[PDB]
Amino acid sequence: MKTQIINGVSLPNIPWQDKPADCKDVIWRYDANPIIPRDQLPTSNSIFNSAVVPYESEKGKFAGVFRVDDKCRNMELHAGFSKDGIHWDINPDRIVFEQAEKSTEEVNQWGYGYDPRVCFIEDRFWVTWCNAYGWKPTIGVAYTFDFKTFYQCENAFLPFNRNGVLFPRKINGKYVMFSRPSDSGHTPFGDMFISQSPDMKYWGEHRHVMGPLRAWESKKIGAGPIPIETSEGWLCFYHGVLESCNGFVYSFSACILDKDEPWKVKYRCAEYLLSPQKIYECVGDVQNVTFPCATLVDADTGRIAIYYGCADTCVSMAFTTVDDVVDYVKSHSSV
Amino acid sequence: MKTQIINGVSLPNIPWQDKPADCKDVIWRYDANPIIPRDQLPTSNSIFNSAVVPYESEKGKFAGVFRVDDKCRNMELHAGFSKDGIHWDINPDRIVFEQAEKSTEEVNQWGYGYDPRVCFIEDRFWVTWCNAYGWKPTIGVAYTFDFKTFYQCENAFLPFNRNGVLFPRKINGKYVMFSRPSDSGHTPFGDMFISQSPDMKYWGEHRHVMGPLRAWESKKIGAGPIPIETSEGWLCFYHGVLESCNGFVYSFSACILDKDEPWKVKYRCAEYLLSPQKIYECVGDVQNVTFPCATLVDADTGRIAIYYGCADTCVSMAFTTVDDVVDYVKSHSSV
Amino acid sequence: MKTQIINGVSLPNIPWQDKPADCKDVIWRYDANPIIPRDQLPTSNSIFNSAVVPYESEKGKFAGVFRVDDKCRNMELHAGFSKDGIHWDINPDRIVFEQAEKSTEEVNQWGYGYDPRVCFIEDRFWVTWCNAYGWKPTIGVAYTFDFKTFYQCENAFLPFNRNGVLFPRKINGKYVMFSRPSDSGHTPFGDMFISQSPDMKYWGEHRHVMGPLRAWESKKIGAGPIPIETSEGWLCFYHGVLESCNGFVYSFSACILDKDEPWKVKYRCAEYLLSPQKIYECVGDVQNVTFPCATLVDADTGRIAIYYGCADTCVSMAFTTVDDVVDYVKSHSSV
Amino acid sequence: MKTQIINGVSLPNIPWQDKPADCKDVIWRYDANPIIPRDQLPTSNSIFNSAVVPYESEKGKFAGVFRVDDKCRNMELHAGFSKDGIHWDINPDRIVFEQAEKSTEEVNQWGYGYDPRVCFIEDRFWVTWCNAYGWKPTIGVAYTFDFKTFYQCENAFLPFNRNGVLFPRKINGKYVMFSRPSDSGHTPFGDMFISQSPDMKYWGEHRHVMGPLRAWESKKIGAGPIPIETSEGWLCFYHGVLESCNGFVYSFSACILDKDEPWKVKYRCAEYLLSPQKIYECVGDVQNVTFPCATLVDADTGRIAIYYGCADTCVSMAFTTVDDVVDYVKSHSSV
Amino acid sequence: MKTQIINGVSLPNIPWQDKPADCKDVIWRYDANPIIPRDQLPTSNSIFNSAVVPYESEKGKFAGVFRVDDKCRNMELHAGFSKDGIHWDINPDRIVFEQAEKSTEEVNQWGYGYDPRVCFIEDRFWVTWCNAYGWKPTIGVAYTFDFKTFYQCENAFLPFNRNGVLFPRKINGKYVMFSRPSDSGHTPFGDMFISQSPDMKYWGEHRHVMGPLRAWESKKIGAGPIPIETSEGWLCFYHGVLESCNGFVYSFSACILDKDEPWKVKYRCAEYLLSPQKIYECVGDVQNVTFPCATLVDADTGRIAIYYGCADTCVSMAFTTVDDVVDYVKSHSSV
Amino acid sequence: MKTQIINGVSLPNIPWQDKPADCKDVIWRYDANPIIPRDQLPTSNSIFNSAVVPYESEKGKFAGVFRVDDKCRNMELHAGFSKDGIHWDINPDRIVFEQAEKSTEEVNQWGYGYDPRVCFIEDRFWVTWCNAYGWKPTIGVAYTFDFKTFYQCENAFLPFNRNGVLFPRKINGKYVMFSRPSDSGHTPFGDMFISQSPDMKYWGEHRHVMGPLRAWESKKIGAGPIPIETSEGWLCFYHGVLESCNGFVYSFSACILDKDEPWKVKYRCAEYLLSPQKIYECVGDVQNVTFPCATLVDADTGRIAIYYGCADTCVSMAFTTVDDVVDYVKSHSSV
């Protein structure tokens, strides 16, 4: 492989399909999407925008935290497990957080939770999600050792904020998180930022990453899945939005960020890499949405399994390789 | 049956399919939806949101008033008839009202009409619909004995108002109608109210029923079909709206209102009972709409057939029972 | 006088100043405006848009219901009295309504109230105002014999409505009220309607009066003071709104309506008769507001004394005659 | 035929399918739509709203200019060629314009271009499109002899303008062009205009054609394909927009314009002639759009083949005849 | 003087006051503003944004075209005359236009007109203003020889457009006009353009001049008075808008455009030269507006008298010199 | 004094004027407002919303940071000095920040700054303001020892945020700062929050304080001057906004927060304590604004001198006492 994975893991059992002969694109979709349908739970209206990591357990080789909206259209998080990373066993009830410290008992009342991202750091799995604080969106933080008990920490930021995604390790001795300042409604703007923390409680040294640039990403952008560490820097899949007369179209692509200062962009692909085109992407609760929240990387082969939400209804998968994405990113670089 | 139907009628011939074994919902769809396609009339752009009652005719056992939108996209009411309540013979031409009284000859000019509701009271069938008075939406009122001639009455209210639905008997000596104060466009709000009339002309004693509450019904709500009288009080299906970044999603559910003072809520289901999920509910003139304007009830068995507009394009059917709805309403109740 | 006053009163004591020689306008202002300053009460933020009638009491020859906004910016009604019609003794505290019938003890909770209109009809003074019902604007209704105790009746209408104004007698056996269908915010529209009632409780036979026409009244219109009965028909001052890039401009003018069917317009003045031009009309809590809620008419001479809110801050007076207004409306008429 | 085609061309090779026996419409759809899928090019996100004329070359009997949106969602024009008018060989790469005079070398920088219209005038093919001038939409103007080299002229008008369409000959000594004053975003208004030029550089004598009228066209209208010259006058297919709560629905119909003063409407069909109803018209990048930019007319038979955009995603075809349309337009005329 | 006036006139009688010793600004105000009060006509609501030129007649040495809004708030143009350029004799009645050619008898029906600009070219005075075409704003054109009879020509452009200002001579043998593409309401955007015409009927070769830039001019800009020809190029006073939470603030400044191609900016002052600060500029029908439509320039001294609208209520005057303004524009230039 | 000032300062030379005999208010205005006019500096468009503390220097007994908007309408901070606290010597030029550490030389480029607040903490003066990071509002942080050199630190938070106000000592060993999550425009919402920091660099443990409540503060609220420590807890003046049809009205009041957990509201005055009512408050750049950013407190007497911006135009002074404010706040408390 021309581009090496750093601090990756060996995933010979990575969900995978080969790139169809007629497929002329960098990324190709799994041939039996969606892998998690809207009604997989008795109480679920939709299941989408969901986080997955390799994790060995009684129920399989992968685990995850899943955005589940019930028939009240309440937004919740459910833990889930899988042997092959495709057919998922999702807890019927929501994660009920325990507080890591007693000092956050008052403040962390449950309201809602959506769009989680999950990664392992040094000794545990960290969950971020869009958490309600007094019914306002900010970034929630929790950790878990076993995806059974979840320990909630302080919300990282003030509202209004969304798309909080942790880098998978400390950089220069500091935890680093993508976020994306927003508002109280259907946010019509959006630049990506990073913020830094020595202890995962106090955040600062905020740095602007990038903002809306090309047409497909002209209205707003946001961080997708956990950054992938690479010979070239941080490989970051991200979402971008185009505004039509009828609403929003959510596509995603990728950029490469400087290894030591992730807010500096080395390359940024000028094209989307996947956009709403199939029936399950264009038809649902929210039309024309493809929203990546997790990837699996096999460091041995550089194969990538991408999980993305479709039309805010279901979860689908797609495949590509680190070499293929990096190559295309660099060969079609914006600015 | 645990809950009794009060002042109901015997309908052994009610359109009916049994609940499938795989089905985990309170309400299940007719397996051959839609029952009325958009192009059933030579001039129809769409047929939806329509009123249906038992009525013994030369042309069948059921009659109705149908919202028909033509290829001007004008909005009109058409009388229809059916033997089985599933296959309909809809008049090719619109209802042309006659004024019940001379005193409305000048006032009631025909501009538009949509979303009729119809029920029998005492000696005749009463029709309500969203009626244009100087191209502003209010509640039109009319009656008929035969679904051949329609006698138009005074508009019940000042604009701007929509979703006028009559209770099917007097209550404490007065006619009672649901309505839903609106504005001059795509109304971004809406609470259910009742008004009271001794004579079907003068209205007053306005009482607030309820407003938006759960996420699925957070933008606005409004009355659906004619209220059903039960031992628990009034069973009322109603629509609720969720606003996404791309627009509105119309779902519907049910509440139970006090027998004597129906603006007082006894139970209200926190969950929708049906939401736009099939292709014909999600794709059409207005995506993501399931909109109930009529139900049939067989008082002998408690079976309910529900007619509902789909994507403002066609008319579909769903089934449930009074007991199933009531049990679920009571056990999943909001406030 | 050329135009006669019908069913008026002898008011030789009417507040008055003669038309200055250098005046060219149909309506001239009192020379020591405002007559009621924003801070006349210890708790008042502003006092404006207020109602006045001849009433003989110990505290004088005139009575009224005044809109008072307090230093919370709450909207309240205070009763008031005056010997000359110019200097006002206003109650320091809000009218606390008593329910006329027990049937409204539940429904009529006090939320807020503004823009009263008042007239004597056959045996008492009737009061209308914009009344909160569940914090939504509609028309409140009350009566009083002595301006000391106020008896609240049913709200005449559903929200959202404002500018409810009674005609000062029954017409064809029915009470008649101006109103103006509105919305839940700073309403960007507005036509005048009348509604009719046999008993001041149930309302129906709604009729359209008129809508925005000329530029000065192009955004919205609304009834002002009590209709004045005349040889020409009903003389009605109404406000109209023009929208600039910075907000609204409230002026007012007059129309003449058919005696028998007051929704039919006989004459309507193309120009405003007064608009915001003085410092106390242009600067204040809401700039450029000129808003009449009462007139006194001396039937013996045709003298009219106009009370009008200025900049939503204070109350001011202006003067004109019935013949002048009538001549000018008829000779400068729209449609 | 009852109506004759004036100044037309003999097109016995026109793409054509007969009206189905079950078709009850003026216009019927090709039965294998779309004819150009979104991904016909390796770089194409979507191909729609496209211009076609008869033109003899080595690659076929018809040529075109096609709107292609690439995977950055940039808007470009690509020339294309076809043997039958149904299977199309479109250039992989955009038209790179040459300037006709040196005088426009400075101002005509390429930004974007979409919705081209093309017609033959005396000695060459003219192209109009929506051209960026400083990223504001206006009407770009060019000509070609071979569809291989394109020569750009002066932008016809100031921004903001869209839907510029040329009449296929001079009228009263002058070139005549449809356009449609717009704004800087998703224009929520739109009337059709004509402007006149002696030389295709300077435009003047601007004339209003018509504005939104019927419901299906209530929000805005614009010109579609090249006007067809006829014994009854100019036959002009046009698009019209209705606004639902979820956005815009684009439909199209026809009108007939006076032969010598084409701003004067003679007839105007009250109904749409085609509206978004099939799955490739309702689902896509932009839901519910059918947008006609080109027709082919066989003057011998009166057969018409219509090229129209679907869902801003793909290109489709429909068929009708000059007589069928003209008769329907004249028998179902608005005003 | 350092900067010379080109093609100017000797104006020893120019209205003038010397700069106060305490004045630290480039432009100082006349000390008895307004020079034209809102009520100078018996019918006028407001008189503002008005055009003025030197012109010898029986009524004085200056003549002009004045925007008068009457008590309907209709917008009209009135002719006016002055002996001293300060006290004005304004015709009580509107200019009623005569068509230059009979070919515009039909189109040029009068709707409204405002914001006139006037300059002498070769042999007559040319008048532009914002003219209604079918109640939409565009630029009207007309000429006069004596300011008594006015000859209307073709509207120069399509709607929507405002701020049409002619250069006072041909340039490269073409008429040159500033305009400012707008929209149907209170336009929230605006760049300056020029267009070119060989005959004042057909217009083309459109060139972008400049856009909003500095904070005080961030929302939109527009041309002011007739360009003044100097040895630095064209001295062009222009208006620019800032948006606060309460509305717009209109200030004005100056730029210097290239002699040969006036769409190329040589200098552009970063600061405003005058902004709303006085009571008559800040209080009125539209608060915070200072709007220049005319200047007199005495070529032998470089004195400049500026006429400008204040709060869309009245006309005021200010003074400066060509040298003062050119030095300041250059030494405080933007880009 | 019933209430004590904790950790206060002896200020016998506090600017002061005794309450007028006819003053029926908690707070009374200085009788020669403004104390700083819009044009005190040669460059200044307006000077308002400014920060003031006691500080012994060569230029006086008080110092501060002043918001100066220049004649580009750029927003700046200027240091200033005063002998009496009423007559100010303000630097003609902006504060150019030094970076406290080189780690912020890249990130902290100057764009704009406004609404400064200043207080002493342990060994230096800390400055917060609304600081542009990539032209997005957030809270800037700096310190000074002498008001001559200012050392900039890291922005406390992500955009979008404003009204950052530091408590004047550590609480529980942490710095505590008011802020107010906003958006990218004229923010139509706003709640007060605090955030906590060990080191003035990293922030967390965010706590909701309060949001809009009473009509005068129905739209949004925000922290005003530095919190004052008191026997009753933290005395905090804050601004509140009401929205009319014409824009915003900015008033201000006071609340009392828990000494140890300042996000917990003990008392909250239901009424405003000062609103826009004088000509310098109601008329100017932004109408109807009274915005407090600094108080002086004499701990010996309880005298409070209040600095506040008026109409975004000038600075005024008001007067009150701790006991007067605390008593009124306690006896007129909201929730």
Side-chain angles (χ1 to χ4, degrees), chain C residues 39 45 71-72 248 287, chain F residues 24-25 216 246 271-272:
Chain C
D39 60 345
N45 171 86
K71 289 178 190 183
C72 298
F248 289 169
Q287 317 87 284
Chain F
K24 65 222 201 166
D25 292 314
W216 72 267
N246 283 4
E271 320 183 334
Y272 64 71

mmCIF file with all atom_site columns, all heavy atoms in Angstrom, chain C residues 39 45 71-72 248 287, chain F residues 24-25 216 246 271-272:
data_model
loop_
_atom_site.group_PDB
_atom_site.id
_atom_site.type_symbol
_atom_site.label_atom_id
_atom_site.label_alt_id
_atom_site.label_comp_id
_atom_site.label_asym_id
_atom_site.label_entity_id
_atom_site.label_seq_id
_atom_site.pdbx_PDB_ins_code
_atom_site.Cartn_x
_atom_site.Cartn_y
_atom_site.Cartn_z
_atom_site.occupancy
_atom_site.B_iso_or_equiv
_atom_site.pdbx_formal_charge
_atom_site.auth_seq_id
_atom_site.auth_comp_id
_atom_site.auth_asym_id
_atom_site.auth_atom_id
_atom_site.pdbx_PDB_model_num
ATOM 1   N N   . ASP C 1 39  ? -45.742 58.561 31.725 1.00 0.00 ? 39  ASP C N   1
ATOM 2   C CA  . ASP C 1 39  ? -45.353 58.295 33.104 1.00 0.00 ? 39  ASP C CA  1
ATOM 3   C C   . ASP C 1 39  ? -46.362 58.869 34.073 1.00 0.00 ? 39  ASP C C   1
ATOM 4   O O   . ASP C 1 39  ? -46.022 59.190 35.213 1.00 0.00 ? 39  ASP C O   1
ATOM 5   C CB  . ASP C 1 39  ? -43.958 58.865 33.403 1.00 0.00 ? 39  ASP C CB  1
ATOM 6   C CG  . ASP C 1 39  ? -43.883 60.374 33.207 1.00 0.00 ? 39  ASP C CG  1
ATOM 7   O OD1 . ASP C 1 39  ? -44.786 60.963 32.575 1.00 0.00 ? 39  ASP C OD1 1
ATOM 8   O OD2 . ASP C 1 39  ? -42.899 60.978 33.669 1.00 0.00 ? 39  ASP C OD2 1
ATOM 9   N N   . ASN C 1 45  ? -45.183 52.339 32.068 1.00 0.00 ? 45  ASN C N   1
ATOM 10  C CA  . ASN C 1 45  ? -44.131 52.478 31.054 1.00 0.00 ? 45  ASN C CA  1
ATOM 11  C C   . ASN C 1 45  ? -44.649 53.362 29.938 1.00 0.00 ? 45  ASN C C   1
ATOM 12  O O   . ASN C 1 45  ? -43.926 54.171 29.345 1.00 0.00 ? 45  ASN C O   1
ATOM 13  C CB  . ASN C 1 45  ? -43.730 51.103 30.503 1.00 0.00 ? 45  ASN C CB  1
ATOM 14  C CG  . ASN C 1 45  ? -42.804 51.196 29.291 1.00 0.00 ? 45  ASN C CG  1
ATOM 15  O OD1 . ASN C 1 45  ? -41.588 51.299 29.439 1.00 0.00 ? 45  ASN C OD1 1
ATOM 16  N ND2 . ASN C 1 45  ? -43.384 51.163 28.086 1.00 0.00 ? 45  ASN C ND2 1
ATOM 17  N N   . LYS C 1 71  ? -43.922 48.503 33.999 1.00 0.00 ? 71  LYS C N   1
ATOM 18  C CA  . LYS C 1 71  ? -42.480 48.484 33.849 1.00 0.00 ? 71  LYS C CA  1
ATOM 19  C C   . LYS C 1 71  ? -41.942 47.062 33.739 1.00 0.00 ? 71  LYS C C   1
ATOM 20  O O   . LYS C 1 71  ? -40.729 46.853 33.746 1.00 0.00 ? 71  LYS C O   1
ATOM 21  C CB  . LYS C 1 71  ? -41.824 49.248 35.004 1.00 0.00 ? 71  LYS C CB  1
ATOM 22  C CG  . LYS C 1 71  ? -42.067 50.752 34.893 1.00 0.00 ? 71  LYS C CG  1
ATOM 23  C CD  . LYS C 1 71  ? -41.477 51.562 36.031 1.00 0.00 ? 71  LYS C CD  1
ATOM 24  C CE  . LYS C 1 71  ? -41.994 53.000 35.957 1.00 0.00 ? 71  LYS C CE  1
ATOM 25  N NZ  . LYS C 1 71  ? -41.412 53.890 36.997 1.00 0.00 ? 71  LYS C NZ  1
ATOM 26  N N   . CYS C 1 72  ? -42.854 46.094 33.627 1.00 0.00 ? 72  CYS C N   1
ATOM 27  C CA  . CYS C 1 72  ? -42.526 44.732 33.191 1.00 0.00 ? 72  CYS C CA  1
ATOM 28  C C   . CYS C 1 72  ? -42.760 44.626 31.687 1.00 0.00 ? 72  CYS C C   1
ATOM 29  O O   . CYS C 1 72  ? -42.447 43.606 31.067 1.00 0.00 ? 72  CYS C O   1
ATOM 30  C CB  . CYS C 1 72  ? -43.395 43.684 33.901 1.00 0.00 ? 72  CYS C CB  1
ATOM 31  S SG  . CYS C 1 72  ? -43.242 43.584 35.703 1.00 0.00 ? 72  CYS C SG  1
ATOM 32  N N   . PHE C 1 248 ? -42.870 49.597 10.441 1.00 0.00 ? 248 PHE C N   1
ATOM 33  C CA  . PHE C 1 248 ? -44.235 49.975 10.069 1.00 0.00 ? 248 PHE C CA  1
ATOM 34  C C   . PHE C 1 248 ? -44.505 51.468 10.301 1.00 0.00 ? 248 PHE C C   1
ATOM 35  O O   . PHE C 1 248 ? -43.950 52.069 11.219 1.00 0.00 ? 248 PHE C O   1
ATOM 36  C CB  . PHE C 1 248 ? -45.257 49.142 10.853 1.00 0.00 ? 248 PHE C CB  1
ATOM 37  C CG  . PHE C 1 248 ? -45.335 47.692 10.439 1.00 0.00 ? 248 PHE C CG  1
ATOM 38  C CD1 . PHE C 1 248 ? -46.043 46.777 11.216 1.00 0.00 ? 248 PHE C CD1 1
ATOM 39  C CD2 . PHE C 1 248 ? -44.737 47.249 9.266  1.00 0.00 ? 248 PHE C CD2 1
ATOM 40  C CE1 . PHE C 1 248 ? -46.126 45.449 10.843 1.00 0.00 ? 248 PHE C CE1 1
ATOM 41  C CE2 . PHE C 1 248 ? -44.822 45.923 8.882  1.00 0.00 ? 248 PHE C CE2 1
ATOM 42  C CZ  . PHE C 1 248 ? -45.507 45.019 9.672  1.00 0.00 ? 248 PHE C CZ  1
ATOM 43  N N   . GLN C 1 287 ? -41.766 53.493 17.033 1.00 0.00 ? 287 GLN C N   1
ATOM 44  C CA  . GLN C 1 287 ? -41.719 54.727 16.239 1.00 0.00 ? 287 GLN C CA  1
ATOM 45  C C   . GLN C 1 287 ? -42.805 54.773 15.158 1.00 0.00 ? 287 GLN C C   1
ATOM 46  O O   . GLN C 1 287 ? -43.260 53.742 14.680 1.00 0.00 ? 287 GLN C O   1
ATOM 47  C CB  . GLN C 1 287 ? -40.337 54.906 15.570 1.00 0.00 ? 287 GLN C CB  1
ATOM 48  C CG  . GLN C 1 287 ? -39.103 54.595 16.448 1.00 0.00 ? 287 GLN C CG  1
ATOM 49  C CD  . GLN C 1 287 ? -38.712 53.109 16.395 1.00 0.00 ? 287 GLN C CD  1
ATOM 50  O OE1 . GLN C 1 287 ? -39.358 52.248 17.015 1.00 0.00 ? 287 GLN C OE1 1
ATOM 51  N NE2 . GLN C 1 287 ? -37.659 52.806 15.636 1.00 0.00 ? 287 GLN C NE2 1
ATOM 52  N N   . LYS F 1 24  ? -39.411 58.962 41.022 1.00 0.00 ? 24  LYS F N   1
ATOM 53  C CA  . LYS F 1 24  ? -40.133 57.801 41.534 1.00 0.00 ? 24  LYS F CA  1
ATOM 54  C C   . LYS F 1 24  ? -39.524 56.499 41.006 1.00 0.00 ? 24  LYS F C   1
ATOM 55  O O   . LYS F 1 24  ? -40.241 55.542 40.696 1.00 0.00 ? 24  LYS F O   1
ATOM 56  C CB  . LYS F 1 24  ? -41.617 57.889 41.151 1.00 0.00 ? 24  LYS F CB  1
ATOM 57  C CG  . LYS F 1 24  ? -41.903 57.808 39.642 1.00 0.00 ? 24  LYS F CG  1
ATOM 58  C CD  . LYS F 1 24  ? -42.961 58.818 39.221 1.00 0.00 ? 24  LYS F CD  1
ATOM 59  C CE  . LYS F 1 24  ? -43.612 58.433 37.894 1.00 0.00 ? 24  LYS F CE  1
ATOM 60  N NZ  . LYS F 1 24  ? -44.866 59.212 37.653 1.00 0.00 ? 24  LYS F NZ  1
ATOM 61  N N   . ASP F 1 25  ? -38.199 56.462 40.905 1.00 0.00 ? 25  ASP F N   1
ATOM 62  C CA  . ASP F 1 25  ? -37.524 55.314 40.303 1.00 0.00 ? 25  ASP F CA  1
ATOM 63  C C   . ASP F 1 25  ? -36.361 54.820 41.138 1.00 0.00 ? 25  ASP F C   1
ATOM 64  O O   . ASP F 1 25  ? -35.782 55.569 41.923 1.00 0.00 ? 25  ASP F O   1
ATOM 65  C CB  . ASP F 1 25  ? -37.036 55.665 38.902 1.00 0.00 ? 25  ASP F CB  1
ATOM 66  C CG  . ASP F 1 25  ? -38.170 55.882 37.936 1.00 0.00 ? 25  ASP F CG  1
ATOM 67  O OD1 . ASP F 1 25  ? -39.109 55.053 37.932 1.00 0.00 ? 25  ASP F OD1 1
ATOM 68  O OD2 . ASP F 1 25  ? -38.119 56.876 37.182 1.00 0.00 ? 25  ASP F OD2 1
ATOM 69  N N   . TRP F 1 216 ? -40.464 42.585 28.855 1.00 0.00 ? 216 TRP F N   1
ATOM 70  C CA  . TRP F 1 216 ? -39.399 43.544 28.524 1.00 0.00 ? 216 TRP F CA  1
ATOM 71  C C   . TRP F 1 216 ? -38.088 42.846 28.154 1.00 0.00 ? 216 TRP F C   1
ATOM 72  O O   . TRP F 1 216 ? -37.165 43.454 27.603 1.00 0.00 ? 216 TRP F O   1
ATOM 73  C CB  . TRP F 1 216 ? -39.161 44.506 29.694 1.00 0.00 ? 216 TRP F CB  1
ATOM 74  C CG  . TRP F 1 216 ? -38.471 43.885 30.874 1.00 0.00 ? 216 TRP F CG  1
ATOM 75  C CD1 . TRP F 1 216 ? -39.063 43.315 31.963 1.00 0.00 ? 216 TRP F CD1 1
ATOM 76  C CD2 . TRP F 1 216 ? -37.060 43.782 31.081 1.00 0.00 ? 216 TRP F CD2 1
ATOM 77  N NE1 . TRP F 1 216 ? -38.112 42.851 32.824 1.00 0.00 ? 216 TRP F NE1 1
ATOM 78  C CE2 . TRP F 1 216 ? -36.875 43.130 32.312 1.00 0.00 ? 216 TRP F CE2 1
ATOM 79  C CE3 . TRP F 1 216 ? -35.941 44.166 30.335 1.00 0.00 ? 216 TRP F CE3 1
ATOM 80  C CZ2 . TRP F 1 216 ? -35.603 42.866 32.827 1.00 0.00 ? 216 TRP F CZ2 1
ATOM 81  C CZ3 . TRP F 1 216 ? -34.687 43.906 30.842 1.00 0.00 ? 216 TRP F CZ3 1
ATOM 82  C CH2 . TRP F 1 216 ? -34.524 43.256 32.078 1.00 0.00 ? 216 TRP F CH2 1
ATOM 83  N N   . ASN F 1 246 ? -40.989 47.102 14.915 1.00 0.00 ? 246 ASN F N   1
ATOM 84  C CA  . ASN F 1 246 ? -39.992 47.984 14.316 1.00 0.00 ? 246 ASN F CA  1
ATOM 85  C C   . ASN F 1 246 ? -38.562 47.655 14.702 1.00 0.00 ? 246 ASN F C   1
ATOM 86  O O   . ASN F 1 246 ? -37.624 48.318 14.268 1.00 0.00 ? 246 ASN F O   1
ATOM 87  C CB  . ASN F 1 246 ? -40.301 49.434 14.668 1.00 0.00 ? 246 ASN F CB  1
ATOM 88  C CG  . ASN F 1 246 ? -41.445 49.988 13.840 1.00 0.00 ? 246 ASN F CG  1
ATOM 89  O OD1 . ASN F 1 246 ? -42.046 49.264 13.050 1.00 0.00 ? 246 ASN F OD1 1
ATOM 90  N ND2 . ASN F 1 246 ? -41.755 51.271 14.022 1.00 0.00 ? 246 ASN F ND2 1
ATOM 91  N N   . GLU F 1 271 ? -39.329 43.793 36.784 1.00 0.00 ? 271 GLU F N   1
ATOM 92  C CA  . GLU F 1 271 ? -39.405 45.028 36.021 1.00 0.00 ? 271 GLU F CA  1
ATOM 93  C C   . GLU F 1 271 ? -38.022 45.435 35.533 1.00 0.00 ? 271 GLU F C   1
ATOM 94  O O   . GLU F 1 271 ? -37.014 45.052 36.140 1.00 0.00 ? 271 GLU F O   1
ATOM 95  C CB  . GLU F 1 271 ? -39.991 46.164 36.861 1.00 0.00 ? 271 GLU F CB  1
ATOM 96  C CG  . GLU F 1 271 ? -41.144 45.782 37.769 1.00 0.00 ? 271 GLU F CG  1
ATOM 97  C CD  . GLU F 1 271 ? -41.709 46.990 38.515 1.00 0.00 ? 271 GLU F CD  1
ATOM 98  O OE1 . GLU F 1 271 ? -40.967 47.979 38.737 1.00 0.00 ? 271 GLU F OE1 1
ATOM 99  O OE2 . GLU F 1 271 ? -42.907 46.954 38.859 1.00 0.00 ? 271 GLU F OE2 1
ATOM 100 N N   . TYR F 1 272 ? -37.971 46.200 34.444 1.00 0.00 ? 272 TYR F N   1
ATOM 101 C CA  . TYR F 1 272 ? -36.720 46.837 34.067 1.00 0.00 ? 272 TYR F CA  1
ATOM 102 C C   . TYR F 1 272 ? -36.428 47.915 35.097 1.00 0.00 ? 272 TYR F C   1
ATOM 103 O O   . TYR F 1 272 ? -37.338 48.380 35.769 1.00 0.00 ? 272 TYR F O   1
ATOM 104 C CB  . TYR F 1 272 ? -36.758 47.422 32.638 1.00 0.00 ? 272 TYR F CB  1
ATOM 105 C CG  . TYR F 1 272 ? -37.738 48.554 32.387 1.00 0.00 ? 272 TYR F CG  1
ATOM 106 C CD1 . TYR F 1 272 ? -37.539 49.832 32.924 1.00 0.00 ? 272 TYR F CD1 1
ATOM 107 C CD2 . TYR F 1 272 ? -38.834 48.363 31.547 1.00 0.00 ? 272 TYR F CD2 1
ATOM 108 C CE1 . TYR F 1 272 ? -38.446 50.867 32.665 1.00 0.00 ? 272 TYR F CE1 1
ATOM 109 C CE2 . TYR F 1 272 ? -39.725 49.381 31.283 1.00 0.00 ? 272 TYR F CE2 1
ATOM 110 C CZ  . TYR F 1 272 ? -39.534 50.617 31.838 1.00 0.00 ? 272 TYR F CZ  1
ATOM 111 O OH  . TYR F 1 272 ? -40.450 51.601 31.555 1.00 0.00 ? 272 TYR F OH  1
#
